[PDB]
Amino acid sequence: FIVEDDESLGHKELKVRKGHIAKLMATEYQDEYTWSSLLNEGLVEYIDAEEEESILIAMQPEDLEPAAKRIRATTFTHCEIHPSMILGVAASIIPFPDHNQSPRNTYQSAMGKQAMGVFLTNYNVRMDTMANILYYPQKPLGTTRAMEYLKFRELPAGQNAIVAIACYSGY
Amino acid sequence: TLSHLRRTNTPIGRDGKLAKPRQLHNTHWGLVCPAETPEGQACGLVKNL
């Protein structure tokens, strides 16, 4: 997101606005803004790996924007879109990944590619070497926003089961 | 399948050092996933956008 400096509302603000985002939601539910149509008037910017040596980024769109839960500069030029989009495809499936250890994330991101579920829908047509389809593939009760874009809710990985963290004597 | 489509790889050589590109770098932020990597002989060598 690009952040203009001088606002007639005083302090500092990012240029995109509620009217624009309403127009976006209307375009979505039409089922004629695009991403490109949002580009062509200076609302977002593509930034390579180097201009970060020339710019300044805000986490939230509120973090310094007005002048028992969690512990959380006035020259911002950009604010990032959403901090959860520093992740990758596999790691966007781990629920609450900010609430555990990083090597555990790395293991899970390795193992998830070995999971089985569906993989496509024309699988009744495609001859293939080895295929693995399970019976009753359920979307997960917990979820995050990204796996909506990953179409993962449409093609789930496994089933969800009732667990119990006990030591029932043996095994 | 999606993870395999977006996937990057570099060559290094035989053994290599430590602070050479195996370890994660500051500049990697927001571009390459700081969580995924295969472990063993490729950690820091094969990365995903």
């Binding site: 606005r17 009217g19 985002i21 | -």
Partner: peptide
């Protein structure tokens, strides 16, 4: 208003627009 700022929840609309345009394998295709 239309010119009010954006609460952080709303940006998923922008993300939806981005993905609806580009897709995911867009760099390969491009």
């Amino acid at each position: 208003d239309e010119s009010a700022p954006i609460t952080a929840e709303d940006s998923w609309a922008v993300i939806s627009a981005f993905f609806r345009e580009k897709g995911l394998v867009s760099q390969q295709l491009d």
